[PDB]
Amino acid sequence: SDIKAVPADSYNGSALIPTGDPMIDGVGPSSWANRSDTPDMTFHNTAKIVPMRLDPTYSIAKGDPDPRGLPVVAADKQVAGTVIELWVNRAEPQVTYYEVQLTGSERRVMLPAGFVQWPNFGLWGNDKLLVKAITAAQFANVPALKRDDQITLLEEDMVCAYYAGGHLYAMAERSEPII
Amino acid sequence: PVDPVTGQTIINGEPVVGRVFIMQKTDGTVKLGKWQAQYDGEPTAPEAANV
Amino acid sequence: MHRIWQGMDPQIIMSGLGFFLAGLALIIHMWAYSITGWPKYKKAQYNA
Amino acid sequence: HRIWQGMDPQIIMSGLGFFLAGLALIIHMWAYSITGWPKYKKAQYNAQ
Amino acid sequence: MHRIWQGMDPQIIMSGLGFFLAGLALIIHMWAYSITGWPKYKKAQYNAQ
Amino acid sequence: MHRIWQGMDPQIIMSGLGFFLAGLALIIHMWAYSITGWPKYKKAQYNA
Amino acid sequence: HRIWQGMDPQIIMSGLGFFLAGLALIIHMWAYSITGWPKYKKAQYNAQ
Amino acid sequence: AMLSFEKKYRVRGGTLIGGDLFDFWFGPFYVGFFGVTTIFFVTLGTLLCVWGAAMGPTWNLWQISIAPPDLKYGLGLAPLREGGLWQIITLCALGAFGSWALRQAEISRKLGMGMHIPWAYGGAVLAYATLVVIRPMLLGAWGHGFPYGIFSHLDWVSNVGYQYLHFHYNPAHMIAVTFFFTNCLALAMHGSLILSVTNPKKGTPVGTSETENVFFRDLLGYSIGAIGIHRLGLFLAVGAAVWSAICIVISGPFWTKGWPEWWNWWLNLPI
Amino acid sequence: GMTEDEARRFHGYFVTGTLGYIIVAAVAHFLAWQWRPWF
Amino acid sequence: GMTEDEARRFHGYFVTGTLGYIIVAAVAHFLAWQWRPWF
Amino acid sequence: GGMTEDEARRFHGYFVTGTLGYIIVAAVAHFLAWQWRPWF
Amino acid sequence: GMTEDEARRFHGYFVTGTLGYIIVAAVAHFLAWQWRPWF
Amino acid sequence: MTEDEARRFHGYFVTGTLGYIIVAAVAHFLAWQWRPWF
Amino acid sequence: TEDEARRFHGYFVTGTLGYIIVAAVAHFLAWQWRPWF
Amino acid sequence: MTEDEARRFHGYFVTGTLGYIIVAAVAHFLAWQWRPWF
Amino acid sequence: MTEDEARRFHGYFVTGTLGYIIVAAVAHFLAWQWRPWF
Amino acid sequence: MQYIDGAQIALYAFWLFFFGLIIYIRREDKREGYPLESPQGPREGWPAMPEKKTYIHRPT
Amino acid sequence: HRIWLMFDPRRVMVAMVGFLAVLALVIHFILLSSQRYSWIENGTLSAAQAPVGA
Amino acid sequence: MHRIWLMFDPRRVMVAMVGFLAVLALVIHFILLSSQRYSWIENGTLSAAQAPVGAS
Amino acid sequence: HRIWLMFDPRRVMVAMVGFLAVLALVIHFILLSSQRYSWIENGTLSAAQAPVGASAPAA
Amino acid sequence: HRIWLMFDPRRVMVAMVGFLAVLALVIHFILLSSQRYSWIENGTLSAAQAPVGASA
Amino acid sequence: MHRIWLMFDPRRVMVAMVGFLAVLALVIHFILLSSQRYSWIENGTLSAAQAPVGAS
Numbered sequence A: 001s002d003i004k005a006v007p008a009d010s011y012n013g014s015a016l017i018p019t020g021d022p023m024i025d026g027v028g029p030s031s032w033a034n035r036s037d038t039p040d041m042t043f044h045n046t047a048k049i050v051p052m053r054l055d056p057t058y059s060i061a062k063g064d065p066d067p068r069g070l071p072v073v074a075a076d077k078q079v080a081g082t083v084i085e086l087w088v089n090r091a092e093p094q095v096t097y098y099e100v101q102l103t104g105s106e107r108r109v110m111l112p113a114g115f116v117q118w119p120n121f122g123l124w125g126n127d128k129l130l131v132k133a134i135t136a137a138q139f140a141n142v143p144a145l146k147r148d149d150q151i152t153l154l155e156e157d158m159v160c161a162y163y164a165g166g167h168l169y170a171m172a173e174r175s176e177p178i179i
Numbered sequence B: 001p002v003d004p005v006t007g008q009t010i011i012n013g014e015p016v017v018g019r020v021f022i023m024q025k026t027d028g029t030v031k032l033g034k035w036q037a038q039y040d041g042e043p044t045a046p047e048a049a050n051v
Numbered sequence C, F: 001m002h003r004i005w006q007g008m009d010p011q012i013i014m015s016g017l018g019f020f021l022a023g024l025a026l027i028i029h030m031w032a033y034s035i036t037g038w039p040k041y042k043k044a045q046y047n048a
Numbered sequence D, G: 001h002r003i004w005q006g007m008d009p010q011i012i013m014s015g016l017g018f019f020l021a022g023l024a025l026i027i028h029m030w031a032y033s034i035t036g037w038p039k040y041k042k043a044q045y046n047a048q
Numbered sequence E: 001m002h003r004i005w006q007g008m009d010p011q012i013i014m015s016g017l018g019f020f021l022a023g024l025a026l027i028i029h030m031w032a033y034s035i036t037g038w039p040k041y042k043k044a045q046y047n048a049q
Numbered sequence H: 001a002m003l004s005f006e007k008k009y010r011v012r013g014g015t016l017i018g019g020d021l022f023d024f025w026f027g028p029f030y031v032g033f034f035g036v037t038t039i040f041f042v043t044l045g046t047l048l049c050v051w052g053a054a055m056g057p058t059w060n061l062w063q064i065s066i067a068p069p070d071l072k073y074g075l076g077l078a079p080l081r082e083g084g085l086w087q088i089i090t091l092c093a094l095g096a097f098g099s100w101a102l103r104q105a106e107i108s109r110k111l112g113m114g115m116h117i118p119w120a121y122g123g124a125v126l127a128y129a130t131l132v133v134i135r136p137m138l139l140g141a142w143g144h145g146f147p148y149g150i151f152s153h154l155d156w157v158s159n160v161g162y163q164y165l166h167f168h169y170n171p172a173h174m175i176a177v178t179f180f181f182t183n184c185l186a187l188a189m190h191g192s193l194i195l196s197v198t199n200p201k202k203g204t205p206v207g208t209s210e211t212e213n214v215f216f217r218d219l220l221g222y223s224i225g226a227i228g229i230h231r232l233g234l235f236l237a238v239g240a241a242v243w244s245a246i247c248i249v250i251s252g253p254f255w256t257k258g259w260p261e262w263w264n265w266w267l268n269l270p271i
Numbered sequence I, J, L: 001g002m003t004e005d006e007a008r009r010f011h012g013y014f015v016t017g018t019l020g021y022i023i024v025a026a027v028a029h030f031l032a033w034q035w036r037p038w039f
Numbered sequence K: 001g002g003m004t005e006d007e008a009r010r011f012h013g014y015f016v017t018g019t020l021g022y023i024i025v026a027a028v029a030h031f032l033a034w035q036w037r038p039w040f
Numbered sequence M, O, P: 001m002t003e004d005e006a007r008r009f010h011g012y013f014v015t016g017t018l019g020y021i022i023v024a025a026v027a028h029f030l031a032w033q034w035r036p037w038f
Numbered sequence N: 001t002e003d004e005a006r007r008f009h010g011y012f013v014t015g016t017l018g019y020i021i022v023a024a025v026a027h028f029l030a031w032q033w034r035p036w037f
Numbered sequence Q: 001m002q003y004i005d006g007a008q009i010a011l012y013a014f015w016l017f018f019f020g021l022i023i024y025i026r027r028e029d030k031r032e033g034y035p036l037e038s039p040q041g042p043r044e045g046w047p048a049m050p051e052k053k054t055y056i057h058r059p060t
Numbered sequence R: 001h002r003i004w005l006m007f008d009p010r011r012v013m014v015a016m017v018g019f020l021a022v023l024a025l026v027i028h029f030i031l032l033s034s035q036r037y038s039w040i041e042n043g044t045l046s047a048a049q050a051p052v053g054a
Numbered sequence S, V: 001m002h003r004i005w006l007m008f009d010p011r012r013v014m015v016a017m018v019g020f021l022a023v024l025a026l027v028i029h030f031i032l033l034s035s036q037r038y039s040w041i042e043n044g045t046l047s048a049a050q051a052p053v054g055a056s
Numbered sequence T: 001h002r003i004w005l006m007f008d009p010r011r012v013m014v015a016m017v018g019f020l021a022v023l024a025l026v027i028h029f030i031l032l033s034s035q036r037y038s039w040i041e042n043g044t045l046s047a048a049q050a051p052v053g054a055s056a057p058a059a
Numbered sequence U: 001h002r003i004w005l006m007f008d009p010r011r012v013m014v015a016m017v018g019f020l021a022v023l024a025l026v027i028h029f030i031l032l033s034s035q036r037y038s039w040i041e042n043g044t045l046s047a048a049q050a051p052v053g054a055s056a
């Protein structure tokens, strides 16, 4: 019993019910793989994913909104923080993560770009970021990093798994039949 | 053959209770045989080209 | 007697009673037209 | 009379009315074809 | 005798007895109509006048 | 002899006997109608 | 008599019922064909 | 039997219909409400296909054919001998194809995934629905659908294609073929690219994402992204089915003459 | 919904409306019988 | 739903309604029998 | 459950009374039907 | 299930019911035989 | 989702259903006069 | 929840049985119009 | 679950199965009189 | 939605709906004078 | 001979090649997540799971 | 009955409504396209005039 | 019988019911429009005596 | 009677009902396809008039 | 009414207008494709001259 | 003997056996239905002397 889940009934093939809070214990869609605890490296032995402040040769293409200083609207339609720094992939130039400072600051969390949607599919005014996967309160329980400048593959899985697991566990309604 | 009196169909000397029909497959379809058999009822082979 | 109406909205009763009476009166009127043949025998006189 | 206990009187009247409405309409159609009433009287008034 | 009704809802009994009686009386009335030929012969008189 | 009814619901027994008796009486009645020819001969006397 | 011990008495009787009911129905079919009983008595009543 | 990492993912929730009653796994398969609905329609449809084979002249697998009704029945349910069995099987197929898509949506919801697979599958279902539902309704008879037989439905395609005297000149068919051919070329390129990096020249280390982008820039001057290739493959494969559905639905319901004659508009431009 | 007190007065008006409607219908069928009897 | 006191009074109302419906139906068949007997 | 021993005892009384009244009334209907068109 | 006391009481009613049903069915076969003997 | 609003909704729903059925009954009777199907 | 199941069962049983009786009457009407045996 | 509920369920399942078989037997006997297949 | 403007909206919706049906009834009256369909 | 012709021979050679290829690809499919876990013990379908495959990484 | 403690009453009635609706449509559609019971066209014929397969 | 709405959502019931009724009404109207006897747009003005009847 | 320990009664019921529905529909559909038992069209015929299938005679 | 507390007036109004516009276009095009009510071509004919479906 | 169940679990073998028996039974019933001699739905009531026999 090291996975913190119990079978529903004694019939085999039955689904597991998590015992605690599946977001943090990593069960079901919140599960992560035990990847290597070392940062990914580019072709020249440098960290693959780094914040822009560590490499000033990167910039934002013209005609693309600068998401820094923009509000982060969570699944509650309540602002969960503000984007302050971008994490980019140097092997293939692309935004990978957003760094969000909470409303009462005192901490910074990461937000994968795959869960970020823009208003009107990015066609009309882009004044905020949409995060449908997690609530504003659970932004505070996103796993943190060991260092402020590089991210290993182990934690990379943990942040992505935590957000992806919130499409089933953010609210009780999301884990229930529609009819 | 048909019974002269009752009108019943006789099969191998035994009358049948009911209206007898000859069984057939879907729309009277018959499985194909050899590829040469495709040319029975067809016109014969065409004459040589005028060159 | 009156205890059958307890808990019932008087508007709902009158709206549902009017629906019954209107549709029933229309059906029996069409029923009565066909039996007596009233509009036919007078329409044909004015259209002769 | 104890059979009515725990039963909503409105549901019972709405189930008796549904029964009587559908049974009376079926027997009326049954009686129309047996007596032949509307047919003979309508043919009298529509023989003009 | 009366213990056969223990642990049962009296309304389920009355609903099933109505189902039995209504379905049975419909089958035998159709049975009876074809045997006596009642509505046929009476409606034949009234539809020939 | 009574020790066979041990641990069995009496309402289940009666419903399963009711199924048997109802379905067997229906099959034998149809069986008996064919043999005696009862409704056939009486139907012919009234529908002639 | 030690063949019964460890066996369910209901399973024994429910398995004898299946055996006897199905065998009595096979042989009643067998007996009807051999004697021709319903055929000859049906033909007496259904040809008059 | 389960994969060595599978146990922690087998959790409840994510269904669209039902609760713990239909939230179990039969062997490797997940059984939902739409898993139960799939099995019902698959069993009913397959048994009726076997019955259609038994009604026909042969048990040969290639020669079995269950044909649609005659055009004179015109959107009615024909006799089962005369094509009505084809219509019943069509309903079972539609129910099974729809249930399969909804069952896939339930599985992705349980795994915290996107909804791309059900909608990608819907492109194939749309093409099938155009062939047996939409186009026959526009033409006014269920008999415009194709028969259910391995080589019988090839005869239908041939004769329908020649109903327009040259089906190659269909403008939507030309586009749909290009989508199919480009998809096959792109899939070969993508499969080779991943395998060549992961299985490189013997004795050398496994390559990186730079190696792919550098290689395709060296060969062609442009390298689509790692996400770009998967977006393109989805677009090419699904767009092939969508353009196929368009190409068949315009033949008959909209264009009735030969397809070569359609190109009059290009030849009669004022210039 | 209605309480017991108001359902007693509602029933009083409802019964009066039913009787008056039936009285008018009775005269209607009475006048229709002389014009064209249906039996 | 209802109570024993409520069902005792209801049963009295229901029986006098069931009864009275039968006599008026009995007159209906009596008048119909005089007009066109169905046997 | 429902209809305990006391309730079932009184229910069985009203059931047997209703069953007999149904039988008697049906017997008269069969007697009237027999005089009109006997079925044997 | 069913106890020892009520297994016998049920069996007594079942035997009486089974017997009375057979005798009543015996009279029906007696009457049917004088009407249409089936052998 | 309370017994109070379930009763208020049921009264309007029943009346709306009741009204819908009668208009269909009048429509069917009107069509039977025009062209009966039996 | 065992009491609410018993009350629902009465509604479902009555509705199921009443629906079959109504369908039996419709089948009776169709037999009068055009018998299938 | 418990053997107490495994005895209750099996009683209704067998009676339901027996009821279904009997009505099917009646249906097959009805069809045989109308149009026998042997 | 304060439930009070719903009454305000309902009056406008009912009048607009009933007014549209009356106008459409006149259009069917005009079309009947031109070419009856019964 | 008479019934046997070149197209049939080529078709059956292709069938054998395809079945071999499918066996090889199914072997490659079982390089992750195997052997399967069951209450009865370890399980492998046909084809059996292949030997462990190791990659080569660039030095740091 | 305790059957509703095993199956959800809300879901059973929804699935039962769907099955009966589909069954009723199939039977109505089978009869509609038959020679004998095409009631939209031949519903006014009497039982003697209705077609019989032969 | 108001207790039914404590089980089923009135929003989802009405939307599902309105959708089914509209689809059913369109199907029946289209079936009659495709028939010979009740193609009311074309014949329409024929009396019941002159309306088509299927073969006997 | 122990079969319900090794199998979920809820799932066996659903499987059984689904199997019976498929089987019943298949048999009804096969008979509707047959000439002798196409009861919608020829159900009013007597057994003496019902179709009987036979093979072609020798001559 | 209390129904507007259940359904959004904007969603209902847009859906209703969209339904009515589609329904109106369908009916106008069904009559246009018919023979009796192809009013753009035969609209000047009198009711006696307008085409009628066959009495067969 | 019984130790085969210590090698194959009773549940899996039973499901496979039931599945194989059902498929075999349906295949044989359908094979006979497609034959001339044993199309019992159609001929059925023919005696063994009247039943079709394949050509010699």
Ligand SMILES: CCCCCCCCCCCCCC(=O)OC[C@H](COP(=O)(O)OCC(O)COP(=O)(O)OC[C@@H](COC(=O)CCCCCCCCCCCCC)OC(=O)CCCCCCCCCCCCC)OC(=O)CCCCCCCCCCCCC
Binding pocket: A011, A012, A013, H001, H024, H025, H026, H027, H028, H031, H035, H036, H039, H040, H043, T006, T007, T008, T011, T012, T014, T015, T016, T017, T018, T019, T022, V011, V012, V013, V015, V016, V018, V019, V020, V022, V023
């Ligand atoms: C190319 C190379 C590779 C080619 C091959 C590629 C293969 C790809 C797939 C790979 C996996 C295959 C193996 C597999 O699926 O194993 C499942 C099972 C082990 O399952 P498990 O792990 O023990 O089960 C877990 C769990 O479900 C436990 O639940 P429980 O034990 O309570 O099971 C309850 C189930 C079963 O009960 C049943 O009654 C179901 C019986 C199904 C089979 C028989 C069908 C006919 C009778 C139907 C019932 C009759 C009444 C009882 O109850 C359920 O309800 C489970 C879900 C069933 C489906 C949903 C409900 C459908 C309802 C409507 C339709 C009804 C039927 C028409 O193991 C076996 O069955 C062992 C044998 C496996 C090999 C296949 C053998 C096939 C033999 C026949 C071949 C015929 C060829 C034409």
Ligand code: BCL
Binding pocket: D015, D019, N014, N015, N018, N019, N021, N022, N023, N024, N026, N027, N030, R017, R020, R021, R024, R028, R031, R037, R039, S028
């Ligand atoms: C040749 C064929 C015949 C014919 C033969 C039959 C026969 C026979 C029957 C029907 C039945 C039905 N037919 Mg048809 N029918 C014909 C032509 C039509 C036409 C048409 C366009 O001409 C239409 C619209 C219909 C429509 C209908 C339905 C109204 C009805 C029920 C279907 C059903 O089960 O739904 C199921 C789907 C649902 C969603 C069910 C919804 C819930 C229902 C409404 C609840 C009922 C509760 C019940 C009444 C309560 C009873 C209470 C107790 C009395 C106390 N028929 C022709 C003339 N029809 C069936 C029926 O039930 O009739 C009563 C039936 O058995």
Ligand code: BCL
Binding pocket: P015, P016, P017, P018, P019, P020, P022, P023, P024, P025, P027, P028, P031, U020, U024, U028, U031, U037, U039
């Ligand atoms: C053979 C068929 C006939 C014909 C038969 C009909 C019939 C019959 C009708 C239409 C209708 C319409 N036709 Mg057409 N129509 C023909 C040819 C045409 C042609 C054309 C180019 O030939 C066109 C463009 C149109 C266009 C139109 C639209 C104006 C309208 C359908 C849309 C709609 O609902 O609008 C909405 C347009 C409006 C003006 C709606 C106004 C609504 C407001 C809310 C009324 C408010 C009243 C007041 C405020 C409140 C009173 C409250 C209480 C009652 C006291 N018709 C041919 C000749 N047409 C329908 C219609 O609605 O007609 C009026 C209709 O029923």
Ligand code: BCL
Binding pocket: H097, H124, H125, H127, H128, H131, H157, H158, H159, H160, H161, H162, H166, H167, H168, H173, H176, H177, H180, H240, H241, H243, H244, H245, H247, H248
């Ligand atoms: C003389 C014949 C004509 C012609 C006539 C036609 C006609 C007519 C049509 C096409 C269509 C197509 N033609 Mg062509 N065609 C010709 C020559 C060609 C040539 C060529 C090299 O010359 C090519 C490349 C093509 C290419 C194509 C495609 C664009 C298209 C087929 C794909 C498709 O629709 O997928 C769509 C995919 C599907 C329909 C599959 C759906 C599958 C469903 C959803 C799931 C099934 C699951 C299954 C039952 C599971 C089984 C069990 C499991 C295995 C266990 N044509 C010639 C000139 N062509 C077809 C088309 O566009 O169809 C829409 C079509 O009907």
Ligand SMILES: COC(C)(C)C/C=C/C(C)=C/C=C/C(C=O)=C/C=C/C(C)=C/C=C/C=C(C)/C=C/C=C(\C)CC/C=C(C)/C=C/C=C(\C)C(=O)O
Binding pocket: C010, C027, C028, C031, D024, D025, D028, D029, I006, I009, I010, I013, I014, I015, I016, I017, I018, I021
């Ligand atoms: C074959 O079918 C075919 C051919 C068709 C043959 C037909 C056959 C059949 C079977 C026909 C059936 C006919 C029938 C039988 O049921 C018909 C039934 C008719 C009936 C019952 C009519 C009843 C009418 C009642 C009326 C008009 C009451 C009006 C009340 C009014 C005006 C007062 C309102 C004001 C109030 C209350 C004050 C509010 C106080 C308040 C608010 C306060 O105080 O708070």
Ligand SMILES: COC(C)(C)C/C=C/C(C)=C/C=C/C(C=O)=C/C=C/C(C)=C/C=C/C=C(C)/C=C/C=C(\C)CC/C=C(C)/C=C/C=C(\C)C(=O)O
Binding pocket: C001, C002, C003, C004, D009, D016, D027, D030, E025, E026, E029, E030, J006, J009, J010, J013, J014, J015, J016, J017, J018, J019, J021
């Ligand atoms: C043609 O061929 C086939 C079809 C085969 C031929 C065969 C046909 C067959 C078999 C027919 C069967 C017929 C039949 C028998 O079965 C018919 C049986 C009919 C019956 C039983 C009718 C009963 C009617 C009862 C009525 C009208 C009662 C009304 C009561 C009222 C108004 C009082 C209401 C309460 C009030 C005012 C106060 C409430 C107190 C409250 C609220 C309180 O206290 O709070």
Ligand SMILES: COC(C)(C)C/C=C/C(C)=C/C=C/C(C=O)=C/C=C/C(C)=C/C=C/C=C(C)/C=C/C=C(\C)CC/C=C(C)/C=C/C=C(\C)C(=O)O
Binding pocket: D001, D002, D003, E010, E017, E027, E031, F025, F026, F029, F030, K007, K010, K011, K014, K015, K017, K018, K019, K022
């Ligand atoms: C084609 O021909 C074929 C068909 C082939 C030929 C074959 C035919 C065959 C085989 C027919 C079989 C017939 C048959 C079987 O044997 C018939 C058997 C019929 C029977 C048994 C009928 C019984 C009817 C019972 C009635 C009416 C009882 C009513 C009782 C009432 C109303 C009281 C209810 C209680 C109340 C009100 C208060 C108590 C509550 C209390 C105290 C509380 O709440 O506490």
Ligand SMILES: COC(C)(C)C/C=C/C(C)=C/C=C/C(C=O)=C/C=C/C(C)=C/C=C/C=C(C)/C=C/C=C(\C)CC/C=C(C)/C=C/C=C(\C)C(=O)O
Binding pocket: E001, E002, E003, E004, F010, F011, F014, F017, F027, F028, F031, G024, G025, G028, L006, L009, L010, L013, L014, L015, L016, L017, L018, L021
């Ligand atoms: C075509 O050819 C073919 C025709 C097929 C040829 C046919 C061939 C064959 C082989 C036919 C076989 C026929 C047959 C086989 O033997 C027939 C077998 C018939 C038998 C056995 C009938 C037995 C009936 C038993 C009855 C009626 C008992 C009723 C009991 C009652 C009423 C009491 C209920 C108890 C109570 C009330 C007390 C509750 C106490 C409680 C709860 C408590 O105290 O707790």
Ligand SMILES: COC(C)(C)C/C=C/C(C)=C/C=C/C(C=O)=C/C=C/C(C)=C/C=C/C=C(C)/C=C/C=C(\C)CC/C=C(C)/C=C/C=C(\C)C(=O)O
Binding pocket: M005, M008, M009, M010, M012, M013, M015, M016, M017, M018, M020, R021, R024, R025, R028, R029, R032, S021, S027, S028, S031, U002, U003, U005, U006
């Ligand atoms: C050949 O032809 C084929 C086709 C093949 C033959 C086949 C035929 C078949 C199978 C037919 C089937 C027919 C069928 C059954 O299945 C048909 C079933 C029909 C039904 C059920 C109709 C019911 C309609 C009811 C309606 C419209 C109700 C409307 C209610 C309204 C508007 C008021 C609501 C508003 C409220 C409450 C606001 C208050 C809010 C409040 C107070 C608050 O907010 O609190």
Ligand SMILES: COC(C)(C)C/C=C/C(C)=C/C=C/C(C=O)=C/C=C/C(C)=C/C=C/C=C(C)/C=C/C=C(\C)CC/C=C(C)/C=C/C=C(\C)C(=O)O
Binding pocket: N004, N007, N008, N011, N012, N014, N015, N016, N017, N019, R020, R026, R027, R030, S003, S004, S007, T021, T024, T025, T028, T029, T032
């Ligand atoms: C040739 O044709 C082919 C097709 C080929 C031949 C084939 C034919 C075949 C195979 C046919 C099969 C038929 C079949 C079997 O499968 C048919 C089976 C039919 C069945 C079982 C129908 C059952 C219907 C039941 C209904 C309608 C019940 C409704 C219940 C209601 C209304 C009550 C709800 C009450 C509520 C909600 C109150 C809640 C209170 C609460 C909550 C409270 O108080 O709290």
Ligand SMILES: COC(C)(C)C/C=C/C(C)=C/C=C/C(C=O)=C/C=C/C(C)=C/C=C/C=C(C)/C=C/C=C(\C)CC/C=C(C)/C=C/C=C(\C)C(=O)O
Binding pocket: O005, O008, O009, O010, O012, O013, O014, O015, O016, O017, O018, O020, R002, R003, R005, R006, T016, T026, T027, V022, V025, V026, V029, V030, V033
């Ligand atoms: C040419 O034609 C072709 C087709 C080719 C030839 C054909 C060939 C073939 C292969 C045919 C196959 C036939 C076959 C296969 O074996 C047939 C097998 C049929 C079988 C097994 C039928 C069994 C049915 C059982 C039923 C219906 C049970 C119902 C039970 C009920 C209703 C009770 C439920 C309620 C309960 C339990 C409540 C208590 C709960 C409680 C107490 C709680 O909760 O506690």
Ligand SMILES: CCCCCCCCCCCCO[C@@H]1O[C@H](CO)[C@@H](O[C@H]2O[C@H](CO)[C@@H](O)[C@H](O)[C@H]2O)[C@H](O)[C@H]1O
Binding pocket: H072, H073, H074, H075, H076, H077, H087, R029, R032, R033, R038, R040, R041, S027, S030, S031, S034, S035, S036
């Ligand atoms: C099999 C139905 C498939 C339903 C799936 C698609 C949903 C859309 C439903 C479209 C329904 C069309 O409705 C269909 O109209 C045709 C028109 O000939 C009717 O067709 C039948 O009756 C008409 C008259 O009634 C006859 O003239 C015609 O020869 C006969 O085939 C069908 O009985 C009816 O089913």
